[PDB]
Amino acid sequence: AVPMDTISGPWGNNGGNFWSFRPVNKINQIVISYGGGGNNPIALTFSSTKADGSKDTITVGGGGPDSITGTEMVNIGTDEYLTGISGTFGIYLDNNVLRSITFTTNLKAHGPYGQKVGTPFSSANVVGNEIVGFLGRSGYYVDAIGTYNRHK
Amino acid sequence: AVPMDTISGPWGNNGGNFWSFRPVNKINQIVISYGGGGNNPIALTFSSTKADGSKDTITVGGGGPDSITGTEMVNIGTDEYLTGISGTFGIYLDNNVLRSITFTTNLKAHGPYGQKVGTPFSSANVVGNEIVGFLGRSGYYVDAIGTYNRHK
Numbered sequence: 678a679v680p681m682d683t684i685s686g687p688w689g690n691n692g693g694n695f696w697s698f699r700p701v702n703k704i705n706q707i708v709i710s711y712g713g714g715g716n717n718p719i720a721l722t723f724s725s726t727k728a729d730g731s732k733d734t735i736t737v738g739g740g741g742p743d744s745i746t747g748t749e750m751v752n753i754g755t756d757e758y759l760t761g762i763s764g765t766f767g768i769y770l771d772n773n774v775l776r777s778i779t780f781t782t783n784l785k786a787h788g789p790y791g792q793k794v795g796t797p798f799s800s801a802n803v804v805g806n807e808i809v810g811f812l813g814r815s816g817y818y819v820d821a822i823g824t825y826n827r828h829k
Numbered sequence: 830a831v832p833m834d835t836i837s838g839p840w841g842n843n844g845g846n847f848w849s850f851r852p853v854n855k856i857n858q859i860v861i862s863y864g865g866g867g868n869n870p871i872a873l874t875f876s877s878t879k880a881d882g883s884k885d886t887i888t889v890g891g892g893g894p895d896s897i898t899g900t901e902m903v904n905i906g907t908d909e910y911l912t913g914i915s916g917t918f919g920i921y922l923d924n925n926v927l928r929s930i931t932f933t934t935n936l937k938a939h940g941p942y943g944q945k946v947g948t949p950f951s952s953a954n955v956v957g958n959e960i961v962g963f964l965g966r967s968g969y970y971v972d973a974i975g976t977y978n979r980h981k
């Protein structure tokens with residue numbers, strides 16, 4: 678049996694389409710796309726820059742016609758890596774979807790981004806753990822999210 | 830609990846790093862990167878073009894210093910979708926890694942690409958099944974590969 682990285686979660690709901698992104702190099706940039714002219718998350722982008730200049734990337738959510746009205750940009754820089762996430766799920770335009778999210782690294786907590794309303798979730802804060810990818814479900818918005826994990 | 834798409838495999842070996850790529854739209858572009866001046870697979874690229882013009886993409890393998898010496902380009906066009914994979918694992922430069930691969934769609938078999946030596950694997954051909962993503966392991970080369978699946 679070929680080992681796979683241990684999954685935390687996903688947290689959230691069963692709507693939308695499954696998605697998964699675990700690139701071989703470090704995820705160093707995240708985009709939270711907002712809709713509705715407020716801080717309403719509608720899509721997430723995760724990207725990993727390769728030494729050859731290529732960039733692994735995925736965008737999940739934003740599958741409907743919603744206009745993106747704003748973004749938050751998150752950079753995970755040198756000697757920095759993702760260690761945890763937390764956030765909330767709740768109603769946006771009659772959908773129970775991601776409403777806020779925090780990306781925590783070994784250095785800082787990036788966030789919270791969005792609206793801190795709704796049902797909470799948080800990954801397990803494990804000393805020496807690195808989030809090396811994400812998975813979940815999405816459609817118009819982000820229906821669920823979890824993590825792939827690897828120890829330092 | 831939050832459903833995830835059913836995994837077939839992975840087939841192969843336990844070396845390298847775990848990787849995973851299940852984009853929300855269809856994978857329409859594959860690159861098989863070769864090394865060594867022959868058809869020796871060293872990396873795989875999977876890409877999915879979104880209607881907004883963004884392109885989800887992952888490249889796995891090619892993590893060492895090897896020069897890319899050739900490629901095979903695979904296009905999965907309109908009314909076409911991936912349905913199965915097959916190939917072999919065997920020794921390349923003292924590593925037991927992917928040596929050949931075929932990408933089968935509802936229209937055509939694309940391949941075999943590489944060298945038809947080594948230990949065989951193939952996914953289950955299921956009427957109405959669609960491969961919606963891939964996962965596996967990789968380092969310098971491709972150590973293992975499997976599929977995410979969704980039915981029509």
Ligand SMILES: CC(=O)N[C@@H]1[C@@H](O)[C@H](O[C@@H]2O[C@H](CO)[C@@H](O[C@@H]3O[C@H](CO[C@H]4O[C@H](CO)[C@@H](O)[C@H](O)[C@@H]4O[C@@H]4O[C@H](CO)[C@@H](O)[C@H](O)[C@H]4NC(C)=O)[C@@H](O)[C@H](O[C@H]4O[C@H](CO)[C@@H](O)[C@H](O)[C@@H]4O[C@@H]4O[C@H](CO)[C@@H](O[C@@H]5O[C@H](CO)[C@H](O)[C@H](O)[C@H]5O)[C@H](O)[C@H]4NC(C)=O)[C@@H]3O)[C@H](O)[C@H]2NC(C)=O)[C@@H](CO)O[C@H]1O
Pocket residue numbers: 692693694740741770771772774815816817818819820853854980981
């Ligand atoms: C400009 C502006 O600001 N306008 C505002 C309006 O937007 C707003 O109205 C509200 O808008 C939201 C957002 O658009 C609406 O929510 C969406 O609704 C659509 C349509 O579905 C609803 O309407 C249908 C009738 O028109 C009805 O049949 C549906 O059942 C649904 O009805 C709703 O039902 C709920 C209760 O269940 C009620 O509370 C609602 O009132 C009622 N609405 C209506 C109008 O009647 C829906 O598609 C959207 O869902 C997608 O996204 C969410 C979030 O990510 C996911 O959870 C869903 O699963 C949907 O994603 C799709 O998921 C399926 C799987 O389930 C995927 O299918 C797979 O596809 C793959 C290929 O990928 C392959 O083919 C597989 O085989 C297949 O299974 C699919 O891909 C995926 N889609 C995408 C794009 O990825 C979302 O729920 C809301 O309904 C609407 N409300 C009202 C009252 O109108 C108003 C304020 O209300 O304000 C304006 O200003």
Ligand SMILES: CC(=O)N[C@@H]1[C@@H](O)[C@H](O[C@@H]2O[C@H](CO)[C@@H](O[C@@H]3O[C@H](CO[C@H]4O[C@H](CO)[C@@H](O)[C@H](O)[C@@H]4O[C@@H]4O[C@H](CO)[C@@H](O)[C@H](O)[C@H]4NC(C)=O)[C@@H](O)[C@H](O[C@H]4O[C@H](CO)[C@@H](O)[C@H](O)[C@@H]4O[C@@H]4O[C@H](CO)[C@@H](O[C@@H]5O[C@H](CO)[C@H](O)[C@H](O)[C@H]5O)[C@H](O)[C@H]4NC(C)=O)[C@@H]3O)[C@H](O)[C@H]2NC(C)=O)[C@@H](CO)O[C@H]1O
Pocket residue numbers: 701702828829843844845846892893922923924926967968969970971972
């Ligand atoms: C120009 C030209 O054509 N030159 C030709 C030569 O290339 C060729 O020589 C052969 O080359 C190949 C390819 O370069 C060599 O194979 C690679 O070797 C390296 C180095 O390791 C070997 O050498 C060490 C000493 O030098 C020794 O300590 C090692 O144990 C290993 O030794 C080999 O052992 C085998 C038996 O097991 C013997 O048969 C060999 O003879 C012997 N060789 C030597 C030289 O002694 C190795 O790194 C490469 O492995 C990576 O890639 C494979 C395939 O994908 C994976 O299966 C591996 O796991 C490796 O990937 C790494 O995997 C680890 C996890 O296991 C990842 O670590 C994680 O990383 C994350 C971050 O991503 C995080 O930090 C985690 O914490 C961490 O765990 C890691 O990321 C990942 N790496 C990458 C880049 O992704 C590969 O095996 C071959 O050894 C060599 N042979 C000889 C005899 O020299 C010659 C012909 O032979 O011809 C020339 O022309």
